[PDB]
Design a binder for these strands. Structure first.
Ligand SMILES: [Zn+2]
Ligand SMILES: [Zn+2]
Lengths: 83, 93, 148, 99, 85, 109, 94, 108, 82, 99
DNA sequence: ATCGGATGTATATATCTGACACGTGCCTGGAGACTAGGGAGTAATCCCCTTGGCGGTTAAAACGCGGGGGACAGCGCGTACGTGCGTTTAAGCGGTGCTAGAGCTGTCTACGACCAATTGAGCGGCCTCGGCACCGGGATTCTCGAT
DNA sequence: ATCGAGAATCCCGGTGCCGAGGCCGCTCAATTGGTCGTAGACAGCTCTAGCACCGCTTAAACGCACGTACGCGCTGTCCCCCGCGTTTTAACCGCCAAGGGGATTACTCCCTAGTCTCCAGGCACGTGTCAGATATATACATCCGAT
């Protein structure tokens, strides 16, 4: 049950909406691939630590507290999901 | 089962002192609990480091005062120090 | 396979070039258990001293060092009552390229000059280091008890 | 004859619309699939609490919004209004994310 | 010009070279031996005893451990011996 | 004080003092813990909570609402100066962003 | 005589003479090495205690330190440091 | 390993195991400390120290010097990817900066 | 009482710092901005240093206080102990 | 008749000279006076170890060098060679120091 | 400078639903009294190193000048991006079913803390010689105006 | 495309000095032996929620066409940093002199940890009702072409 090339699920309209919230009025056509690459890098960095945290506790389910701990470790505290 | 604790009731009491007619949802309550826990960890860790630097083995009230001065910005730190000193003075007598 | 192929040519190399004052061979059915004999070096208080030793080869070779031990008795800062050798080549800085001839010669080299810095037994090292001249009599004595 | 707006006004309208709301701008099933793909690239046969995926989505969207603010500032600094990949690269380098 | 089989032996294996790795000290050894020595013994070359940890870290990420030139020269000359393994 | 009431009420606080004392004792911070640290810490925490709740209540009132949601907390934190510096790296879930548009992008007169 | 102060000077010098037998080290470089060792010790031993408080344990074992090494060191340093630590522990036990 | 030898040489290390055990047992980290944790932590510290010292010695030799100075330490650290990432928020006193000139500024 | 000592950071010194930073051309309005940012940084660090000194009941700002203040801000310094 | 270097070829020489050395580029007495002035602004009747002043100088110089590197990149982004205060402002904003 | 559509956003009213605020049982954690001991407060002495001053010498800073190159404004081209519409896709919702794994309870056994005796690893102080700094002279190499 | 003159940098050889490497004495902290209370490892059982599938709307995504306005290159001007020479300022070095306060030691007392008993505060669970979201219909602000 392997999943392949799902990064295309972050479509161009979604990136445009994120830019609109960020305050961008006009967007170049090469922004979308760069945004996909940056998002993939960030997700890999967070999920590696989340999986390490869930592996230390001898579990098979990645809880929300593992994600919160990883985000706090990387320097991006998140309020709302525990802690 | 098991019991899990939180600062929810005290946050609600403070809110009722401040705004007697407003309420608070559940997500906001969770955010407030996270904030209180985070500030607790910050101040306690700074106080621990302060006590370790001076070759002490105790966390007294002046440790917490210095930690509050180091963490919080200017006016926030001033008001927090005033409130903590007032609470300690009312407690000791 | 790998380990046995290494040991066969190690034995062949030892046989075709017999090391001076050291001999070795297989005593058991297999080549994992070996016996060896070492003669005392000329510039040592171990004149005319024969020492027997037994060695076991671990299952993974040469990536793990072999185990050596003394069946006979000798007094040494690096050798205990059981006869185990305290040599950095044997335990810590072992390189897989090292052959049995090199380690068996380093044993005799250590016999020439004991290493007191990291002794297995401390009091024997103290007795050796405090003065060599006083102990040299006991060194020959220990040779007559076992080596001679 | 048909009515149409000059290019730029609808963009400002979208900016005002999406800065007043607080929902999530990425569809949830594709993001969940991407998270699961990366995780199974790390360790096989993993399970995810729904709160974990929700937290990951919140964090990623906040990060992208902040990065786009910095990118907009970088683009404006060069006497432009469009944001280009060099703006993203410069913002990331100055932030120390890639150096 | 063409190297012989004498210089095509692994110091630890005493067999034919497979997936050669050439350390900065110009000590060539087969890949399984390098992996085993790195994992278990010293994180150093078995021959002249110099540290190659930084080189290993640099070349493992970029997949450049194997010596391409020597492997290309060797693989064409002795297909049968490589097949025997 | 009277040495008869509860510790929280003896110091005039609403946040707990016994729970804070236990948390400071069992947190692996120091070998010993004084008897005035929990009161001081509870006072500081209560002051900060009261400040943020006051600002969030004001933000909710400006929106014709009688319930603080994460949006009002985000507005209260970001629209301040010391609270924004104290919580610079903190992400508030369902908080949104402060509305602003750069002056260059607005249409020319 | 002044009060005794502790440092990693002799151990760092032994390591240096192991890697570079003919190279010495000055005093400021030694003071930088001592600070580096202290900083990494604090980092690992402090992030390996949150790892035990998270799981409601009370003992720091070689399983918390291994995971702290995994989390704190970068991609290729955390594969060699973990191997060296495991090798040292195995050599210590047997 | 056999007993009757010092703890640091039983594990094949150079950094002290008793001192690391005491520091772990006195720094307010946890209520109890396992037996194998000091060995692991000392091994990691010694590995990192040797890792930096090798590159520092190489940089010192490239300058025809026989003594490591902070300049050689920073030349070693900042030219290695993992070491630079590990110490990226750290200032080394009397170390300077790497030679780096933007290609636009060079004459045409 | 010392006053107006920010001018000891001369224009040649700022030029040397820029040259080490890799700068080829420098505009004439950059020196006041550099003085301002340097003053802000110094105030921020020295406030924490003096706080650390005062907590220890001392009257001298040792190097340990400076090292701790720098570390607290995310600017760890190697070389002066710690 | 007298020999002159074209504008730009003495700046690169200084760049290469000062990137090859490790000394401190600010005079010590003026910096010490400034440090003492700020400290006496904070708390009166203060004394300073010489190591503290040296550490402050090292930290300040490292910070300024990093800031000037970022400023140079910002200036190069806008297709310039000269650095201007807006470059410093943008670099500090993106790094989060001034926001 | 408006004037008219035309479109989008704002404003007022019915309604209904699910989450928030409150009430109840109880049990586990916090409060109260008592004892023992070591941590920290206070006083006194030592001597280190911080502050202040003077004279010289000279490296670094300050000031002025001539000019070339870079910053900035203005024009023109065309090409990529914004807006709008019709069509295809799969997200979202509701509902059901199954079981894997998180979570809790009971035993008990081995690992880690604590204490006493002891001695060698490591720290402080001294000493000496070689590695590196410095001076002076020559060779090598960019740099620029002129062809 | 180049040749040559003036200037900056690199090599090489000789002299000197101070700090890094090693030795000696000593004291205190790490080691070894022994005992004990409990932390967690293992086995068993509960049951919650994570995973998978199905069908129906319909909302968001996609693809295409037209036009426009913004990015990008080119030219011109001017003025402002840069390189260089001359003069002035004060930094740096060596030296002496005083005393504040950092650091250590000894004594003591009182604040905090640990133990036992007890009881009420807050946590889990259940319930009712009203605050806000949704649908519907007007009212007004704003944008664009055209005078
Ligand atoms: Zn091999
Ligand atoms: Zn080698």
């Amino acid at each position: 049950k392997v999943l392949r090339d799902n990064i295309q699920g972050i479509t161009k309209p979604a990136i445009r909406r994120l830019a609109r919230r960020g305050g961008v009025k006009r967007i170049s056509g090469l922004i979308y691939e760069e945004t996909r690459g940056v998002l993939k890098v960030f997700l890999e960095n967070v999920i590696r630590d989340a999986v390490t945290y869930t592996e230390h506790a001898k579990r098979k389910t990645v809880t929300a507290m593992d994600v919160v701990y990883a985000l706090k470790r990387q320097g991006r505290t998140l309020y709302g999901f525990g802690g | 089962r098991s019991r899990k604790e939180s600062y929810s009731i005290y946050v609600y009491k403070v809110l009722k002192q401040v705004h007697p007619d407003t309420g608070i949802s559940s997500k906001a309550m969770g955010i407030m609990n996270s904030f209180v826990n985070d500030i607790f960890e910050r101040i306690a860790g700074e106080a621990s480091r302060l006590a370790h630097y001076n070759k002490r083995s105790t966390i007294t009230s002046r440790e917490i005062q210095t930690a509050v001065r180091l963490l919080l910005p200017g006016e926030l730190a001033k008001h927090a120090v005033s409130e903590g000193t007032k609470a300690v003075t009312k407690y000791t007598s | 396979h790998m380990a046995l192929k290494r040991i066969n040519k190690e034995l062949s190399d030892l046989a075709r070039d017999p090391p001076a004052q050291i001999s070795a061979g297989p005593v058991g059915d297999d080549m994992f258990h070996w016996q060896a004999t070492i003669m005392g070096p000329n510039d040592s208080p171990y004149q005319g001293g024969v020492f027997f030793l037994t060695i076991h080869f671990p299952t993974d070779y040469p990536f793990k060092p072999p185990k050596v031990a003394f069946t006979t008795r000798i007094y040494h800062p690096n050798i205990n009552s059981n006869g185990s050798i305290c040599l950095d080549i044997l335990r810590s800085q072992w390189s897989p390229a090292l052959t049995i001839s090199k380690v068996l010669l380093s044993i005799a080299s250590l016999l020439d000059d004991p290493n007191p810095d990291d002794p297995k037994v401390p009091e024997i090292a103290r007795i050796y280091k405090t003065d060599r001249d006083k102990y040299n009599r006991i060194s020959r004595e220990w040779t007559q008890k076992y080596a001679m | 004859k048909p009515h149409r707006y000059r290019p730029g006004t609808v963009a400002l309208r979208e900016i005002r619309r999406y800065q007043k709301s607080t929902e999530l701008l990425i569809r949830k099933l594709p993001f969940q699939r991407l998270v699961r793909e990366i995780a199974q690239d790390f360790k096989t046969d993993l399970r995810f609490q729904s709160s974990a995926v929700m937290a990951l989505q919140e964090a990623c969207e906040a990060y992208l919004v902040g990065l786009f603010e910095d990118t907009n500032l970088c683009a404006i600094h060069a006497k432009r209004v469009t944001i280009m990949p060099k703006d993203i690269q410069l913002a990331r380098r100055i932030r120390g994310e890639r150096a | 010009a063409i190297p012989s089989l004498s210089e095509c032996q692994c110091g630890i294996c005493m067999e034919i070279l497979v997936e050669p790795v050439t350390l900065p000290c110009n000590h060539t050894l087969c890949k399984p031996c390098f992996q085993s020595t790195v994992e278990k013994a010293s994180l150093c070359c078995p021959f002249c005893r110099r540290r190659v940890s930084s080189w290993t870290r640099y070349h493992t990420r970029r997949n450049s451990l194997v010596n391409v030139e020597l492997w290309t020269i060797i693989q064409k000359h002795y297909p049968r011996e490589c097949k025997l393994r | 004080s009277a040495k008869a009431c509860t510790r929280s009420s003896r110091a005039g606080l609403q946040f707990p003092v016994g729970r804070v004392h236990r948390l400071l004792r069992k947190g692996n911070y120091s070998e010993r813990v004084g008897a005035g640290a929990p009161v001081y810490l509870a006072a500081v925490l209560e002051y900060l909570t009261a400040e943020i709740l006051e600002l969030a209540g004001n933000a909710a009132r400006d929106n014709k609402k009688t319930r603080i949601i994460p949006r009002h907390l985000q507005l209260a934190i970001r629209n301040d100066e010391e609270l924004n510096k104290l919580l610079g790296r903190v992400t508030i879930a369902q908080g949104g962003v402060l509305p602003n548009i750069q002056a260059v992008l607005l249409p020319k007169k």
